Structures are given as C-alpha cells and as structure tokens.
Design a binder for this molecule. Structure first.
Ligand SMILES: *[C@@H]1O[C@@](F)(CO)[C@@H](O[C@H]2O[C@H](CO)[C@@H](O[C@H]3O[C@H](CO)[C@@H](OC)[C@H](O)[C@H]3O)[C@H](O)[C@H]2O)[C@H](O)[C@H]1O
Ligand SMILES: CO[C@H]1[C@H](O)[C@@H](O)[C@@H](O[C@H]2[C@H](O)[C@@H](O)[C@@H](F)O[C@@H]2CO)O[C@@H]1CO
Ligand SMILES: [Ca+2]
Ligand SMILES: [Cl-]
Length: 496
C-alpha cells in the first residue's frame, strides 16, 4: 500500500492545485515526463457545491455533492483523457479523495452544483449518490452542537461534523461501498493512488474497511498485484490523543511536522539553525520515513488554512522557499511532494489574509488555461513552482541520488551546512548573514560539475556556477549571503 507506484527513477509528485484536466494532460507530455516527475496530485474530481458567496472559493471543491466526475477541472471524458495520456508517458495520477464528508450542513438545497445534481443538506439528501439521512453520523455524534468541539476527545473528532461538514457514517457497509464504488471507478480509469482528505476525522478501522474493497491498479499499465498508493491527510503536530501512527496500517501519512519545523528552522525562529538539521527525520519526532509524505507547504497551510502556522514557507517567500524545497528534495527522508499554486490577492489585516478564499485564476468562474511563457514560466497567474529551475533541477537531483545514503554532513554550528548522497550528489546551504567560502569533502568522483541551482548542464557546458572536485573528493564552495539563491547542488548527471 505504501509504494507510490511511480516509474523507477521518478521520486516526486507535484500538486497541480486547481488545474484543469486538459492542462494537466499537456503538462504531463510536454514537461512532467521529460523532466522526470513521478506523478500529479489532482484536485477532487467529484462533483462539488458551487459557492457564489464568496465567488467560487477553492475550498468549494471539498464539499461533495456526488461522485460524478464533473467539476470545474472538467468532465469524465476529459479526466480519462488526462489519466491515459499521463500514464502513457509514465506520469501517475493521484486523486484527492474527499470521503469523510459531504457538503456543509448549512448549504442551501438546490442544484448549485458543478454538474447540476440536486442535493438537500438540510434533509441529508444526496440523490445523485444516493445518500440519505441514514448515511450520516447525526445520531452518532455526542456533542451539543453536532460539530467537532474538542480535539482531546478522539471519538467526537471522528463521529462529529468538521466545521459543519456533514459526516458520513463510514461504519456502514453501504456507505463504505458507495465510496469504494467511486474509488474503484477511478482506479479502473488508471489512477495510481489517493490522498485521503481528513483522515484524522475517520476511524483507522473504517478506512481499512474501505481500502479492502479497492481494486488493484489497471493491469494495462501496472504489473499484476499493484496496490493503489495511499497517503492519509492527518494533521498531527503532537499533543493530541490521535496520532498519525494510528493510520500506519492503511498506508502513508502526511507529515505536517515536516514543513512546520523546516519553516521555523529556515526562518531561524526561536533561535533555530540549519546546523540542527543534522539528524533531520525520525530524530525530530517525525513518523518513519517509509510512511511519510513530505512537503514544505500544501494547498491548505500556504494560505493559513492548515497546520504549521505562520512558519510555513511558500512561493511568496521565493528565496527561502527555494532553499527549503531544495533541502527537502536532497534529503532521503520520506516521499516528496512539490507544490504548484496560483497567485491570489493576498491581503493581510490584523495578521490574517482576508482573501485566503480566492479560487484559481478565472474568467467569470471559468478556470483559466495554463499558458507557457518562452522562458518556460507560466502565465495566467499560475505560479508553476515546479517549473522554477531551482526546483525542477532538485526534483531531478532526487532521482539521480535515489537510494544513496545521507553522508559527508558538514555545518559551521550556525546556518551553513552541507551533505551528500552516497557518491552521486552533494548540496551546500548558506543561511547565515555572512559569506560561506570553504573546501568540503563531497564524496563525489573527481571532475567539473555544474551547479543545478544557479544554472544547467547544456551541451557539455554549465550555464551557472561550476564546481571542481579533486582526486580526494574535496571541492571549494563559495556562497555569499547576498546570492540570489544561497545554496549550490551538484550530482552525477550534472558532471561535465
Ligand atoms: C480536506 O477537506 C476539507 F473540507 C476539510 O479539511 C478542506 O477544508 C477546506 O474546505 C472547507 C469546505 O469548503 C472549508 O470550510 C467551509 O465550509 C464550512 C461548512 O459550511 C464552513 O463552516 C461553517 C467554513 O467556515 C467554510 O470555510 C474550510 O475552511 C477549508 O479549509 C481541506 O482543505 C481539505 O484538505
Ligand atoms: C528562465 O527563468 C527562470 C529564472 O531564471 C529562475 O530564477 C526561476 O524564476 C523564479 C524565481 O526563482 C523565484 O524566486 C520568483 F521570482 O519566481 C520566478 C518564476 O516566476 O525560474 C525561471 C523558470 O525556470
Ligand atoms: Ca468523520
Ligand atoms: Cl496534504
């Protein structure tokens, strides 16, 4: 259950947040495949509530109406087209599965849905599934409000409504079956796995019961017996009765401690320093590496809607963000997910962004196409961090050093550190307020290597910084605290 199911040599997935199916299919062929990306996490493909107040917020997609593959990203035909084209190019698709709940209980009944399906939250009626009052936990929840009120009580966290979201009775075989029917529909289409949204709000046993009904991956693309990749969204920063480890029997889990701590470290909050990252991983209280899905930021916490707090680094913090992502992609701990977002009118008032609800770039509610600029960046307000040279090249770096051990660690006791991966890669970071100029042991064979952060290796030549490794594996590195990118990375495939 725990394997990403990516092609050998591809070690990362990217979240193409709110991207349309047709756009992802093209990206798979024109960029993701050639650049060695392992897969794509797509936004919920199932019909959701169409919210006009505010105007089509991104979170409306987390309020299911039915399991029809009909959304602002496209219809079933477009979804299949995308999965097939991506799979045909060796890039996997992972679905953001919203199966813990339906829409908000306060939402007005009617046909304000992405596929016109009728629904009535008040009467608990979702005929397009179909679900009825008998399929929700209204009678199971014991809180006075019917909503989750105290996280110290593991029971209400699972049986009550998350911020009013109608909670499905996942103990019922009928409900489990309707969800499996939806997920099997996707697996048969060709999806390689799923992100289980709000897993903390579901009983480990109920999730397992659902997974037990899931098919193996489509044998036209995957070897027989291939199980869908499962990564459960569990927000556990410690201090709660519910632990992410309670879900290890179903698959991997999102390690929100990862981005939160890395952000605090890179920002140097409360006296933290990169030198402390020497024992990064389980040593910091994180889950086992083979059960972790890591990331610097996600669609939720990049806009203050998730765990991590104000320490989370995002594309808005471009310089520090690139370093955090680089460190993550270079370090062996966990399975890495790169974030790809869109720009929005961030407006901070009293420490809170009042425009954190804004949906993807659009024209009258119609998601804008992803355009590619001659410099390979994206237009139409799509950030496309996965296309940033510094990030794209680190994604490749991880592929190249796949399997190599963490070694040759170095640090100045402050914020200047470096480490290698076996004899296939080496990375140096300078997050101090002074320059870093020193000769280090790289563990790499002698030769001239192109720094993949400041440049690229094109036709036997480096476009950016060049590093010279001697016969003893040592090499001189020089990084000024004023460099655009205060870190250098070199690997086996960047050698001249
Ligand atoms: C997982 O799925 C979620 F729903 C729960 O973690 C996502 O949460 C986001 O979407 C919800 C739903 O739109 C949003 O809450 C809105 O709707 C509820 C219900 O009516 C309102 O409560 C009264 C709430 O104020 C609304 O904002 C969440 O705020 C949003 O974070 C989550 O991101 C997914 O990972
Ligand atoms: C060809 O443009 C490159 C650019 O040289 C590289 O620096 C990066 O640009 C990012 C930048 O790193 C980031 O800090 C912020 F300014 O955003 C831009 C992209 O919008 O990548 C591009 C494309 O590879
Ligand atoms: Ca629940
Ligand atoms: Cl997540």
């Amino acid at each position: 259950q725990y394997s990403p199911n990516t092609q050998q040599g591809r070690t990362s997935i990217v979240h193409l947040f709110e991207w349309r199916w047709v756009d992802i299919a093209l990206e798979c062929e024109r960029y993701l495949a050639p650049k060695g990306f392992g897969g794509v996490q797509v936004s919920p493909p199932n019909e959701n509530v169409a919210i006009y107040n505010p105007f089509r917020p991104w979170w409306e997609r987390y309020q299911p109406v039915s399991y029809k593959l009909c959304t602002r990203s496209g219809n079933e035909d477009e979804f299949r087209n995308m999965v097939t084209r991506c799979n045909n190019v060796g890039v996997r698709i992972y679905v953001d599965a919203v199966i813990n709940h339906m829409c908000g209980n306060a939402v007005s009944a009617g046909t304000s849905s992405t596929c016109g399906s009728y629904f009535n939250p008040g009467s608990r009626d979702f005929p397009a599934v179909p679900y009825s009052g008998w399929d929700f936990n209204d009678g199971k929840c014991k809180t006075g409000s019917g909503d989750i009120e105290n996280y110290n009580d593991a029971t209400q966290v699972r049986d009550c409504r998350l911020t009013g979201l109608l909670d499905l009775a996942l103990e019922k075989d009928y409900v489990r079956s309707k969800i499996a029917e939806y997920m099997n529909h996707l697996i048969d289409i060709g999806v390689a796995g799923f992100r289980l949204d709000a897993s903390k709000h579901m009983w480990p046993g109920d999730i397992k019961a659902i997974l037990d009904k899931l098919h193996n991956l489509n044998s036209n693309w995957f070897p027989a017996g291939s199980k869908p990749f499962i990564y459960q969204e569990v927000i556990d920063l410690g201090g709660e009765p519910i632990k992410s480890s309670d879900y290890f029997g179903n698959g991997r889990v999102t390690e929100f401690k990862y981005g939160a701590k890395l952000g605090t470290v890179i920002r140097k909050w409360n006296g933290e320093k990169m030198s402390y990252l020497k024992n990064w991983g389980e040593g910091w209280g994180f889950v086992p590496s083979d059960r972790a899905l890591v990331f610097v930021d996600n669609h939720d916490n990049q806009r203050g809607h998730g765990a991590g707090g104000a320490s989370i680094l995002t594309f808005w913090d471009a310089r520090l963000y690139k370093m955090a992502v680089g460190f993550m992609l270079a370090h062996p701990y966990g399975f890495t997910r790169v974030m790809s977002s869109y720009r929005w009118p961030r407006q901070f008032q009293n420490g809170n962004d009042v425009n954190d609800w804004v949906g993807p770039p659009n024209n009258n509610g119609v998601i804008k196409e992803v355009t590619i600029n001659p410099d390979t960046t994206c237009g139409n307000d799509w950030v496309c961090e996965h296309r940033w040279r510094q990030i794209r090249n680190m994604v490749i770096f991880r592929n190249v050093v796949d399997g190599q051990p963490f070694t040759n660690w170095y640090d100045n006791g402050s914020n200047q550190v470096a480490f290698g991966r076996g004899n296939r890669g080496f990375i140096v970071f300078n997050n101090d307020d002074w320059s870093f100029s020193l000769t280090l042991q790289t563990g790499l064979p002698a030769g001239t290597y192109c720094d993949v952060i400041s440049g690229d290796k094109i036709n036997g030549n480096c476009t950016g910084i060049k590093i010279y490794v001697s016969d003893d594996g040592k090499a001189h590195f020089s990084i000024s605290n004023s460099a655009e990118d205060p870190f250098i990375a070199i690997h086996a495939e960047s050698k001249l």
